[PDB]
Ketohexokinase
Amino acid sequence: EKQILCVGLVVLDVISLVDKYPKEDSEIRCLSQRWQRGGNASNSCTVLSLLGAPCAFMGSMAPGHVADFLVADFRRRGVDVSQVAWQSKGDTPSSCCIINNSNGNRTIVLHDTSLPDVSATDFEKVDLTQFKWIHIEGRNASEQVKMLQRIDAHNTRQPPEQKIRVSVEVEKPREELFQLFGYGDVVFVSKDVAKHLGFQSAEEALRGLYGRVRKGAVLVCAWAEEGADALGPDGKLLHSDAFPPPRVVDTLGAGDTFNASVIFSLSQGRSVQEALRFGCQVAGKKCGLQGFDGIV
Amino acid sequence: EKQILCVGLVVLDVISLVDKYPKEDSEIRCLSQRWQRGGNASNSCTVLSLLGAPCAFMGSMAPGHVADFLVADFRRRGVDVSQVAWQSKGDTPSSCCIINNSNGNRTIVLHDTSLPDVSATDFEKVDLTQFKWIHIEGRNASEQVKMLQRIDAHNTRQPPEQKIRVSVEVEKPREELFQLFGYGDVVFVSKDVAKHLGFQSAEEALRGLYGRVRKGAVLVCAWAEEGADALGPDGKLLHSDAFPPPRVVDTLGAGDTFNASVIFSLSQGRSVQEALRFGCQVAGKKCGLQGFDGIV
């Protein structure tokens, strides 16, 4: 059975919950503390795996303690890591995150050696016959365009039933990523890119950005508590409410859980409306849980 | 040569070395990062190892990756882990440590909650004929006294020449530990404890607290830049100046280096006076060093 590939960043977050932020030069105990693999492409694989869809992660890593921990996690959850671009030097990104018990505050100390990004030449070496869906976390745009072009060229030599579906996320606020909009069957734009572009709601954003997508494509924008919306080539704006959990305990990865869910659903041949709804159910559920496990 | 046994915590410390201490609700970018075996008894075994002294660690660990790292590290250093108390489930202690670059202060967010402690039951299964010196990190006091009494019971049927020497560390400001004083030939008390009880200097700390030890014991107190002092049965107050590094960069475990150096010095039949200086020479140098390698 063909897998879903997710190209993006990975990170080891060490998350600590405390009652009060630590005064310098002190030793205090934790309420809780967990080690969690993260990064957008990385979380989507976590969700795709729990939802029972075979998937693969491709990103940059370097050998070391963190990579070892990260690869172990991937494997345990069944995520394929064969396509990973290993680098000669640097460390795989890691961070320690202290979380305040009442204030909700989050201080992050981050270790990141600027590993070269997955390049077009890295992606040339990936055999595409294994994949049914590919999803690219927008980062180094001009290289990623080459990748998307490579996929486009692949699809032209294939019957429709066997074409690879492609999705793209534009989640950081940078001029360079705009070029991604023109590729992919599904394009995810985040609230924060949307608001930074001056848009005040998911409706405006879709209607404002749709002109930038390849013909036939679908633009999706999830707006947290206000649900999620989408716009297709037929111009009807599809909506889903959010599914707020009784208490929102953890938000880290909710957007990644949204995207993976929409991908999974469209992947299973469901409709955009259905996929929007599904994305919202799963994301809301995750928000009432520590990490990703209890989603399914 | 018989082994020195160290009883207490073992921890996988995630050190992050930063420019300035970070402000709450902010994302600072790390200078360097690493994993270190830590925990008080654990660090003392690292130091005891570097001096060339055979040693063994006893504490609670639990199956998983964290234990794999720590155990591996114990072996890299020759430390005997056969006396360890393996639990069936739960997670081995781990922590997030932030070290300042300029001042060199260390801030610890420890996670030592999961596992049950080394019980007095566990300790009876220890062949006391293997060790010449048993050191106990003061933690679960009421069980630790049982262990100490069992050692006292053992010494009774052994001549002065070949009789196990015992020490205790009182490092946390929790009343529960006050009992431990009456046991052990050498009783380490820290600056963090001394100040909690209202003591201004290392001298007044020893004077006030000596009535608490057993007849003929040695009360030690290290006080960072102000060296370290000691008081025995005779009553002559021995002191030592501090040997500061050319540039203080890492304080994390400096106390655990002092203790270890004093224990070592003493077990090799030197005097309290010489022991102190050695504690200060080595503890000091460890402060100009990122890690424990190079302290001798």
Remarks:
- Chain B touches chain A at residues 14, 16, 18, 21-30, 32-33, 35, 65, 69, 94, 96, 98, 100, 105-113 (CB under 8 Å).
- Chain B has one domain: 1-296.
- Chain B has eight helices and 15 strands.
